[PDB]
């Protein structure tokens, strides 16, 4: 008999929202997309519009090329048989060059060259997309927090497939493109380095990953709990504290004696998440380059 505000009871709709203009080149915005009543029960029903300038186009082109380069290799391994493609879809894998080739680009297409090509497309797609997170915020006069947080995820990605392989001396150290294969690579990486549970950066990384679910469950629940006081209108609660923000602060002060403000909790949010891939990248980078066996390392230092 008491609504919980998890799903909406009634949806309302008005003219398609084309968004704020600011310094955005409207010529690069698409038209609005379809409205989804299904999505409207949980969140917004409106799809689009999206902004696609030159950089965006470049990013989607590389992204797709990356995906298709791997897909072509898969069909090949499947002997071009549709039934085999689906059957072993998770077993197919585009692997990097063998150690023998070091960091060169001389490896044959079916023996590393194709992995390098795919990786080149991924490199361009990811970094150009990073440019988008920065520029889309700049055009709207917004802070660059999103581009900075994204850079943290990019750090772990860069370390795994580019920076560490280079410091190790060969592309063979990089991660392969495959569902089961990248899992196998992950398990093997830990085995070869003496168990990552002995890598302090790995364990901190875990504390932050768990911490992120801990914090978002806390935050999501808190805001919904005070949504009856307009709590989710966070920007205005920051600019003019309401009873929603006061009750949220007191809930946590009375429960665990925490200091809490509407803006401050979002600083806990961005950092808790960002630290996952930040501590993680350092942990991976140090593996093999400076520390061969974390267990052995832990016994000394």
């Amino acid at each position: 008999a008491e609504y919980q505000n998890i799903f909406s009871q009634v949806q309302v709709r008005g003219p398609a929202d084309l968004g704020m203009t600011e310094d955005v080149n409207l010529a690069n915005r698409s038209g609005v997309g379809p409205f989804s009543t299904l999505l409207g029960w949980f969140g917004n029903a409106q799809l689009g519009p999206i902004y696609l300038g030159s950089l965006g186009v470049l990013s989607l082109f590389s992204g797709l090329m990356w995906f298709f380069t791997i897909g072509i290799w898969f069909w090949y391994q499947a002997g071009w048989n549709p039934a085999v493609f689906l059957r072993d879809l998770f077993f197919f894998s585009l692997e990097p060059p063998a150690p023998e080739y070091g960091l060169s680009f001389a490896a044959p297409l079916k023996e590393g060259g194709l992995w390098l090509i795919a990786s080149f497309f991924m490199f361009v797609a990811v970094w150009s997309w990073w440019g988008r997170t920065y520029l889309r915020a700049q055009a709207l006069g917004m802070g660059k927090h999103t581009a900075w947080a994204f850079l943290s995820a990019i750090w772990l990605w860069m370390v795994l497939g580019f920076i560490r392989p280079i410091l190790m001396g060969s592309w063979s150290e990089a991660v392969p493109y495959g569902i089961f294969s990248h899992l196998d690579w992950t398990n093997n990486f830990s085995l070869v380095h003496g168990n990552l549970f002995y890598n302090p950066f790995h364990d901190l990384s875990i504390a932050f990953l768990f911490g992120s679910a801990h914090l978002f469950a806390m935050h999501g629940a808190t805001i919904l709990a005070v949504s009856r006081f307009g709590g989710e209108r966070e920007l205005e609660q920051i600019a003019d504290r309401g009873t929603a923000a006061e009750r949220a602060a007191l809930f946590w002060r009375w429960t665990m004696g925490f200091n809490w403000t509407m803006e401050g909790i979002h600083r806990w949010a961005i950092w808790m998440a960002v630290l996952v891939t930040l501590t993680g990248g350092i942990g991976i980078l140090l593996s093999g380059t400076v520390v061969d066996n974390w267990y052995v390392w832990g016994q000394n230092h």
């Binding site: 009634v10 929202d17 029903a45 006081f229 003019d240 923000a245 350092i282 230092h301």
Partner: protein, 238 residues
């Protein structure tokens, strides 16, 4: 050893980050006070952070925090014990005096504005193009209180224009006047809208808005605070 230096350095960084986070979360509510409103002796281990200033749009000024704090409203409560740490009993009607779970903050007495400077929330009849797009349309349904008696009828939905969502239900009472009910506090059913937080006889007491086509931040707080306070104080009639 580079690994030792890195992890050692990281813990230092981490200690600084936690210090920063703790102080950032002190921009509202500090300095701490005694139950009588005076500055408390123990202000905690962290000092207040240097003030920061937010520039508010639409010429509404700025906000600087931390800054001088004051309720800017009367608080109808009184001590129930001779020492700190105990409850403070309402001196009158808590629902009417706005204390306890029925509290409200003295927010700006102006409406929240969207990115274009227009009122963010408007009754649907006054919002061009807006209409119900899914679910049971509550407009026209009778409103029932926790005492299982009908208190009024839904005459409109107040929507958030920029975010296209229902925020309040406008309810007409027997005397012809209307009141706003938080969308998060009503249950829309097939033949009625049920309100568990209030008994029929408490609807007339819901704070009213000065202008019929807009609601200020101050008014929203008084309305939302009042309705929520019914869960505890209307209990006898539930």
């Amino acid at each position: 050893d580079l690994a030792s230096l890195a992890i050692y350095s990281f813990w230092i960084f981490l200690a600084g980050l936690i210090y920063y986070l703790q102080t950032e979360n002190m921009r509202e509510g500090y300095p701490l006070e005694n139950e009588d409103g005076t500055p408390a002796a123990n202000q905690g281990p962290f000092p207040l952070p240097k003030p920061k200033t937010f520039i508010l749009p639409h010429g509404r000024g700025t906000l600087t925090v931390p800054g001088p704090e004051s309720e800017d409203r009367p608080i109808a409560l009184a001590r129930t014990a001779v020492s700190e740490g105990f409850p403070h009993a309402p001196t009158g009607d808590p629902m009417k005096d706005g204390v306890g779970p029925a509290s409200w903050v003295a927010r700006r007495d102006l409406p929240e504005l969207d990115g274009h400077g227009h009122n963010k929330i408007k009754p649907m009849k006054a919002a061009a193009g807006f209409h119900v797009s899914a679910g049971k349309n509550p407009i026209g349904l009778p409103v029932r209180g926790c005492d299982l008696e009908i208190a009024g009828k839904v005459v409109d939905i107040w929507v958030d224009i920029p975010e296209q969502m229902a925020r309040f239900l406008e309810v007409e009472l027997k005397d012809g006047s209307t009141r706003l009910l938080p969308m998060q506090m009503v249950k829309v059913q097939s033949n009625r809208v049920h309100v568990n937080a209030l008994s029929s006889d408490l609807f007339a007491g819901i704070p009213t808005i000065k202008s019929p086509t807009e609601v200020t931040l101050l008014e929203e707080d008084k309305i939302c605070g009042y309705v929520a306070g019914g869960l505890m104080y209307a209990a006898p009639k539930r």
